[PDB]
Amino acid sequence: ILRVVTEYAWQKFIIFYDSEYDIRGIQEFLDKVSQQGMDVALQKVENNINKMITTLFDTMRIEELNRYRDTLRRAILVMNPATAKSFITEVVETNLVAFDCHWIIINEEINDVDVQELVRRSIGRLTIIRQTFPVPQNISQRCFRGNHRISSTLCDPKDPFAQNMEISNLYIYDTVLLLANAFHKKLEDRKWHSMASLSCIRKNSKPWQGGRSMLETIKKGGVSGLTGELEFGENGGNPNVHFEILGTNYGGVRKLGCWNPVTGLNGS
Amino acid sequence: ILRVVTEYAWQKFIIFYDSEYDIRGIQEFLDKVSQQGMDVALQKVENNINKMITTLFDTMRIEELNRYRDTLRRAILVMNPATAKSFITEVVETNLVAFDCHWIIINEEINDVDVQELVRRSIGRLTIIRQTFPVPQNISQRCFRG
Ligand SMILES: [Ca+2]
Ligand SMILES: [Ca+2]
């Protein structure tokens, strides 16, 4: 979000977040914008937008709303798409934004149906930032990885399930996939160590003697799945991630660029 | 509608009407705009807007839609408010109109709830023309006549 904001040369904008978001996620962002001397407002968006905005007009006086309108010309939404949809509509309909506004929505999880609906509801420039998964061309090969066949319900992107999957769902698939390959290699190499029946609340209880070798095998595993490549670095965490950046100035959405943490930003 | 159009100095605009409207109602209007040399398009709006506009983008090519977009900058809606609501939203969301547009809605019957909702849905200038009834001040005397 910092990189994108920097590219647009924003100096003044408002960050909107939903009622479940943990703002520690942007503590580093807030530090940096302050360090660069920007004017950044924060507001939590209640889950019922209708009473929020109605309350606003009543509560706030004219000169405040004029200040508020100006502030909304540049905004970042850090919220789930459902709340964002409702929020965008209500501000638009109540004339709190206009054609010159530019809003950014950022969330790993925004599906194609959500993106289309957000664009439909917005009336200025909109930028959408979401995580994307490297998936093959030729729709037929989308449902295979080598000889491994994936249920069409997960890989057919015309499928309602597929279009409604949570990101965690994709990772769950690849996790099962990764484990299977880990077990396979361990079995094939004839270096199997059996599972053990363990006991928890027993300060005497011992750990699984097989755990260290299994962990090492899984940790050094890698598979191609629905998320792209799943694998682990030396620190035990998946390093692979990709973000796409979508846009539309109104008057329809297109790809502006891509981001990943090694190469950085590509495109405008 | 003629008087209002004359006041705004329109020279080119499109008239949209719903599927129940009897266009003989505007035959005299059409005569007069033609006599003044205006460029006036007519289209019936089907009762399901969603398939109408979807059909449109598929059916029509680019250069037609550009012609069409330009034409929609000035429009008159001669339809019931329910159909107008849906119609305004769908054109707005599909970027067939923009901030510079000016639309007129005319119907004797458009209640206060409809008016508020139309304004909410529109994104340019909107003019609403409806019949009104002279009703007393002091809400108490509204419910009496003598
Ligand atoms: Ca739109
Ligand atoms: Ca409006």
Curated annotation (Swiss-Prot), chain B:
**Glycosylation site residues:** N138
Instruction: Report the subcellular localization.
Output: Postsynaptic cell membrane
Give the result of T54N, as annotated.
In a colorectal cancer sample; somatic mutation
Family membership, please give it.
Belongs to the glutamate-gated ion channel (TC 1.A.10.1) family. GRID2 subfamily.
Please name the disease the record associates with this protein: Spinocerebellar ataxia, autosomal recessive, 18: A form of spinocerebellar ataxia, a clinically and genetically heterogeneous group of cerebellar disorders. Patients show progressive incoordination of gait and often poor coordination of hands, speech and eye movements, due to degeneration of the cerebellum with variable involvement of the brainstem and spinal cord. SCAR18 features include progressive cerebellar atrophy, delayed psychomotor development, severely impaired gait, ocular movement abnormalities, and intellectual disability.
Record's subunit section: Tetramer; dimer of dimers. Interacts with EML2, MAGI2 (via PDZ domains) and AP4M1. Interacts with BECN1, GOPC, GRID2IP, SHANK1 and SHANK2. Interacts with CBLN2, but not with CBLN4. Interacts with CBLN1 (via C1q domain); the interaction is CBLN1-NRX1 complex formation-dependent; CBLN1-binding is calcium-independent; CBLN1 hexamers anchor GRID2 N-terminal domain dimers to monomeric NRXN1 isoform beta; promotes synaptogenesis and mediates the D-Serine-dependent long term depression signals and AMPA receptor endocytosis.
Print the domain comment field: The PDZ-binding motif mediates interaction with GOPC.
Q: What does the protein in this record do?
A: Member of the ionotropic glutamate receptor family, which plays a crucial role in synaptic organization and signal transduction in the central nervous system. Although it shares structural features with ionotropic glutamate receptors, does not bind glutamate as a primary ligand. Promotes synaptogenesis and mediates the D-Serine-dependent long term depression signals and AMPA receptor endocytosis of cerebellar parallel fiber-Purkinje cell (PF-PC) synapses through the NRX1B-CBLN1-GRID2 triad complex.
Q: What is this protein called?
A: Glutamate receptor ionotropic, delta-2
Species source reads: Homo sapiens
